[PDB]
Structure formats: structure tokens, C-alpha cells
Design a protein around this ligand. Structure first.
Ligand SMILES: CNC(=O)c1cc(-n2ncc3cc(Nc4c(F)cccc4Cl)c(COC)cc32)cs1
Length: 346
């Protein structure tokens, strides 16, 4: 009679529509436990994410509402698209949980990063990342927090970005991964579309080095890794800085910065055949153009898509697909609950 049923995965309770069977865990973290399942109605495997009272506080609520709203604005194969959204609760007063359903992928990009990838797969993953970012930008969405843990991949090299980036305080075991954020974000500068190119360069470089490029306890540590490796930025960059942050950055110890042959030596690249020698030099060239502190000097998304390392995959239908409510302010728990509930059941 009832449309739903409940099972215990890990230690969370999943109450899902009966069409979804054989729930197995695949991931946990920030704002959602996730299960794989078989969708008996679509005859395909899916991933199901549980949002446990997303309205419980501002940080959870703004992200839940935003990503439920934004996913109807984008339509692109390298960007999340939902198959279903539902709550097992019946009225607003009973509402607690939201369940999101998408295609089941094969792996997280963190997993792929730990592998040895030929140039064809690396360049195809990066090409798809840039296509998705370009689609987001065309829809007026600048991500600012692109990171591998929110990117998923299938065995055939196809890739999807799962989140929409930045707009806090969390009272939980949770901690935010900040290593892929641009200097604009680290330093509070304001930004344009190519803020996301930095994060792609951080992902790129980690595929080559198999180590996080700019680790650190906080932005303090992080900034130190940035300047130690790329060198202190030019005065032209300093002048963009708010006057207090400028003082801190200018008074940091001055480093000259390593060249990119030394940051990404030949050893890290496939370079036995002439084809692979050439691709290694094209890869390091692209790296040197997106790991650039000053956004005025950093390569754009469009130019990155024309780079010789990337454009071997080009095709008009992928990079330029037709683009498409609103982003809201501070609300109470009660108000967020109703906003999310109403978006859940359009
Ligand atoms: C055999 N397959 C595997 O081992 C793997 C499959 C995946 N995989 N595939 C899809 C997918 C979606 C989400 N998040 C999510 C969701 F489930 C539903 C709606 C929205 C969102 Cl953002 C997560 C959780 O990411 C932290 C992992 C996911 C990763 S490893």
C-alpha cells in the first residue's frame, strides 16, 4: 500500500520509494549519506543522496535550496542532472528529509587522480571539466570551490561535476577542503570566471604529482605553499588587494618561485614516444598558464579549451550548449523548511 520502505545502510536510515532496491553504501561526508541502488522502473543503477533536515541551519539550508534551484537551470552532460527528488514525509509539518537521485557513476575523481593516466585520458577529463565550467559560467554560475571529491567518473572516461560552489559555521565533525580554491578566494579579492581555472590547474597538477599542490591547516599554511612554489606575485597583483590583506601578503617572506620544469619534471610524464614527449611539454605549458596567481595573467576558460593539450577533443555541441528561482537571503529555520519543501514538490 505505502509507496516507501526503510532500510539501515551503514548507520543511517534510508526511507526510499519501493522502485529503488538493493541499497549499498558508496560514500559519506559533508551534507549527505549516499547509496547505490537499482531502479526497477528505469531498469538502471542510481545513486541516492539523503539530505537529513537540510533546514536545520543556515549553511545546510542555503546550499540545499540553492542546489535544488540551480539544477533546473543547467542542462549539460558534464553537470549533475537529477532523475528524481522526493521526501517520504507527507505534509510540511512532518517534513524532514530530502532524497536526491542521479545516474550511478563508477568512481570519484580522487580515485582517478591516484592512478597513472595516459595523456588521452588526462586531457579528456580536463576537457570535460572545462566544458562543464563553461556551461556553468554561461548560466551565470561561477563555482569558486571546484574540487575532486565533488567530481565523479564512469569507466568510459565520462565525467560529471556534482555541486555548484560557494555562496558560515558548522557544529559538526565536518571540515571543508580548501586546497583547490584560487588566491582570489584565499585572500578575499573578488573574482571573475577564470577563478575556476585555478582549481582545474590544481587538479591537473595533482594528477601529475600525485600530491596535493597547496596543502595546509588553514589559508595561512596554504598561501605559504602557493608562494613557495610559484613565487611572490608582482606589485600589479598587490594593488588589487584590500589594504589590510595587502600588508600581510607583502610582509610574507619573499620567494623567487620554481620554474614549471622543476615543479613538474619530465619524470612525472609519459615521455617515451615522440607523441608522449610532445604531450608532456603541452601539459606543462597548460599547467604554467592556469597555475598563475594573478587572475589578470591567468588563462581563460575559452583559451584553455583552445590549448593544444585540450582541443583534440573539441566539438561545438559540447562547449556551447544553450543556457537557460533567484538566490535568496537570510531566513529562519521555519522559512527555509517551507522554501525547500515547496521546491521538493514543485
Ligand atoms: C560503483 N560505483 C561507485 O563505486 C561510485 C559511485 C559514485 N557516485 N555516482 C554518483 C554519485 C553521486 C553522489 N552524490 C549525489 C547523489 F548520490 C545523488 C544526488 C546528488 C548528488 Cl551530489 C556521490 C557522493 O559523492 C560524495 C557519489 C556518486 C561515486 S563512487
Amino acid at each position: 500500500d505505502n509507496q516507501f520502505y526503510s532500510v539501515e545502510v551503514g548507520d543511517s536510515t534510508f526511507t526510499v520509494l519501493k522502485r529503488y532496491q538493493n541499497l549499498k553504501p558508496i560514500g559519506s561526508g559533508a551534507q549527505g549519506i549516499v547509496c547505490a541502488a537499482y531502479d526497477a522502473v528505469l531498469d538502471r543503477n542510481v545513486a541516492i543522496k539523503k539530505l537529513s533536515r537540510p533546514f536545520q541551519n543556515q549553511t545546510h539550508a542555503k546550499r540545499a535550496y540553492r542546489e535544488l534551484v540551480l539544477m533546473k537551470c543547467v542542462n549539460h552532460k558534464n553537470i549533475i542532472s537529477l532523475l528524481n527528488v522526493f521526501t517520504p514525509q507527507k505534509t510540511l509539518e512532518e517534513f524532514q528529509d530530502v532524497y536526491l537521485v542521479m545516474e550511478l557513476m563508477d568512481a570519484n575523481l580522487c580515485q582517478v587522480i591516484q592512478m597513472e593516466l595516459d595523456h588521452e585520458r588526462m586531457s579528456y577529463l580536463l576537457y570535460q571539466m572545462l566544458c562543464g565550467i563553461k556551461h556553468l559560467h554561461s548560466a551565470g554560475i561561477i563555482h569558486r570551490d571546484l574540487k575532486p571529491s565533488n567530481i565523479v567518473v564512469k569507466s568510459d572516461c565520462t565525467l560529471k561535476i556534482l555541486d555548484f560552489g560557494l555562496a558560515s559555521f558548522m557544529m559538526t565533525p565536518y571540515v571543508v577542503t580548501r586546497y583547490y580554491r584560487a588566491p582570489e578566494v584565499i585572500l578575499g579579492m573578488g573574482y571573475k570566471e577564470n577563478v575556476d581555472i585555478w582549481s582545474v590547474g590544481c587538479i591537473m597538477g595533482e594528477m601529475v604529482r600525485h600530491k596535493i599542490l597547496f596543502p595546509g591547516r588553514d589559508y595561512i599554511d596554504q598561501w605559504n605553499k602557493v608562494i613557495e612554489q610559484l613565487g611572490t606575485p608582482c606589485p600589479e597583483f598587490m594593488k588589487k588587494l584590500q589594504p589590510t590583506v595587502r600588508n600581510y601578503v607583502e610582509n610574507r617572506p619573499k620567494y623567487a618561485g620554481l620554474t614549471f620544469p622543476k615543479l613538474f619534471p619530465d619524470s612525472l610524464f609519459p615521455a617515451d614516444s615522440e607523441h608522449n614527449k610532445l604531450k608532456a611539454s603541452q601539459a606543462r605549458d597548460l599547467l604554467s598558464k592556469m597555475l598563475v596567481i594573478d587572475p589578470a595573467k591567468r588563462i581563460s576558460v575559452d583559451d584553455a579549451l583552445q590549448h593544444p593539450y585540450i582541443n583534440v577533443w573539441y566539438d561545438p555541441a559540447e562547449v556551447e550548449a544553450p543556457p537557460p528561482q533567484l538566490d535568496e537571503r537570510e531566513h529562519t529555520i521555519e522559512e527555509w523548511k517551507e522554501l525547500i519543501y515547496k521546491e521538493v514538490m514543485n
